[PDB]
């Protein structure tokens, strides 16, 4: 149904006289499509999904210029944030930037965002209205006044409501086979006895796309909040995803428990039982 | 496509 385009940017200062590591990635939904890495040979934005390869040289020169321009902006910021926070030059520090747009089923603008972090904590984020800012602390208020004076919000609003959305649509058309496709979870259950009276039942969901899934356990038709271990959704490496949920179960009572799988790739919700 | 509304902090 609904879609997203998301760009993530990391710059890491290296200590002393020391040039920063820069990595930028772009996604559509849960599929990576582009990369810049400052450690690679090319110093160009590079294709990572087959449907972007068809783009002409004006795109590749164009995107590269922008992604470098990001990096060299991040470089100045690393110097500036050292000053704003009274930090020496002997340390390694990190700036992260995220932006992008969400769209609905009709591919119309839903919601845009532009967030910024220093050393893994919120610095400044564009608000939902895209007119204004949350400055998380006092150095970020200085930045908030700069960005307000410079009409940064306006510029980002034009990108997030316009450009982001228009490019998102073109990406979903050109890669319609890959991007508008769902991979239903292939599901199973394993059973390992741990003591003479108890057992772990583990419900597997494998090779699904997109990553969004719900795995829940119920015992006798009621949600098992208690003994649920639920791992973080993990990539398989082939563009699809994996997840499991487990419960601790007294032996003889394994058929009290149902595993429930919700995924948009599925015609109905799935129910699994050990039998 | 990436942006142009991005400014030094």
């Amino acid at each position: 149904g609904s879609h997203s385009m998301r760009y993530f940017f990391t710059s890491v200062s290296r200590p002393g006289r020391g040039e920063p590591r820069f990595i930028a990635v772009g996604y559509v939904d849960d599929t990576q499509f582009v990369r810049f890495d400052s450690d690679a040979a090319s110093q160009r934005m590079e294709p990572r999904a087959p449907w972007i390869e068809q783009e002409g040289p004006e795109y590749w020169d164009g995107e590269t210029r922008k992604v470098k321009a990001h990096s060299q902006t991040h470089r100045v910021d690393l110097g500036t944030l050292r000053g704003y926070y009274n930090q020496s030059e002997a340390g390694s520090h990190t700036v992260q930037r995220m932006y992008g747009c969400d769209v609905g089923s009709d591919w119309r603008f839903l919601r845009g965002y532009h967030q910024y972090a220093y050393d893994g904590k919120d610095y400044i984020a564009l608000k939902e209205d895209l007119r204004s800012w949350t400055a998380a602390d006092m150095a970020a208020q200085t930045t908030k006044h700069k960005w307000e004076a410079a009409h940064v919000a306006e510029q980002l609003r034009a990108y997030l409501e316009g450009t982001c959305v228009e490019w998102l649509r073109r990406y979903l058309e050109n890669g319609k086979e890959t991007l508008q496709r769902t991979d239903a979870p292939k599901t199973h259950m394993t059973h390992h006895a741990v003591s003479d009276h108890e057992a772990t039942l583990r419900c597997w969901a494998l090779s699904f796309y997109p990553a969004e899934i719900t795995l829940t356990w119920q015992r006798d038709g009621e949600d098992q909040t208690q003994d649920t271990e639920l791992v973080e959704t993990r990539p398989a490496g082939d563009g699809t995803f994996q997840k499991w949920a487990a419960v601790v179960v007294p032996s003889g009572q394994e058929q009290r428990y149902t595993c429930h799988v919700q995924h948009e790739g599925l015609p109905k919700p799935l129910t699994l039982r050990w039998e | 496509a990436a942006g142009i509304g991005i400014l030094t902090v």
Partner: T-cell receptor, first 102, second 113 residues
Framework: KEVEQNSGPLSVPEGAIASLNCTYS??????FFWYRQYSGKSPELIMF????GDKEDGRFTAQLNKASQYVSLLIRDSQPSDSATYLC???FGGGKLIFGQG | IAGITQAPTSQILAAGRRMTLRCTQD?????MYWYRQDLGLGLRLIHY???????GKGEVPDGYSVSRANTDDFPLTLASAVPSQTSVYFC???????????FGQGTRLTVVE
């Protein structure tokens, strides 16, 4: 690369509407600018535009159509101090701000 | 009052000589540019800089060196002076890449053999 403007010279009588067009090659261009240049002087900004559609500023209306790669400037009610070479500039990414011929 | 200043406003060069056009800006702009203007061909981008410390080649970089040590300054230097560089040169700046460019006064340059 290519930023292409309307072929001049444009002779337009006083009080009329004058009309300037600009085409560009880069589909991903995100910033668009109209500049005024009197003879032997610096270009100065008339208007910037970022989004598709109409931008009003007094006697000046900017129009941006990203799909056909088109930028325009309509000059209403034209005074004799509008007599200048008009410059379209289009941004091709990072620092690649490229001008038309004028 | 914050602006952009170019220097000199006009120069006549003998061929082969080196010459450096100054461009300085008070406005705390990250981005700085140099253009050449010629009769039929409009403005042509020579070199740019998106922030203090970094540069980039434009449409016509050849014959022209550029430098960006600090935020304020972007001087344009010409090593071997050919007659094809006879032009008017405009320095400009913009607060960040892709915003409105603000132009300096202009330099009229004629290299004579």
């Amino acid at each position: 690369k290519e930023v292409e403007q309307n072929s001049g010279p444009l002779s337009v009588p006083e009080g009329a509407i004058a009309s300037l067009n600009c085409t560009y090659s880069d589909r991903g261009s995100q910033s668009f600018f109209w500049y005024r240049q009197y003879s032997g002087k610096s270009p100065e900004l008339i208007m910037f535009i970022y989004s598709n559609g109409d931008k009003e500023d007094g006697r000046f209306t900017a129009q941006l159509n990203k799909a056909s790669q088109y930028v325009s400037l309509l000059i209403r009610d034209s005074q004799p101090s509008d007599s200048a070479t008009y410059l379209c500039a289009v941004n091709f990414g990072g620092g690649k701000l490229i001008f038309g011929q004028g | 009052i914050a602006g952009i200043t170019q220097a000199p406003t006009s120069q006549i060069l003998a061929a082969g000589r080196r010459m450096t056009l100054r461009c300085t800006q008070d406005m705390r702009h990250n981005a700085m540019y140099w253009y050449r203007q010629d009769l039929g061909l409009g403005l042509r981008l020579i070199h740019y800089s998106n922030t203090a410390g970094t540069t980039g080649k434009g449409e016509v970089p050849d014959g022209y060196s550029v430098s960006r040590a600090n935020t304020d300054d972007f001087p344009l230097t010409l090593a071997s002076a050919v007659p094809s560089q006879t032009s008017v040169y405009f320095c400009a700046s913009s607060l960040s890449f892709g915003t409105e460019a603000f132009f300096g006064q202009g330099t009229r340059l004629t290299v004579v053999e």
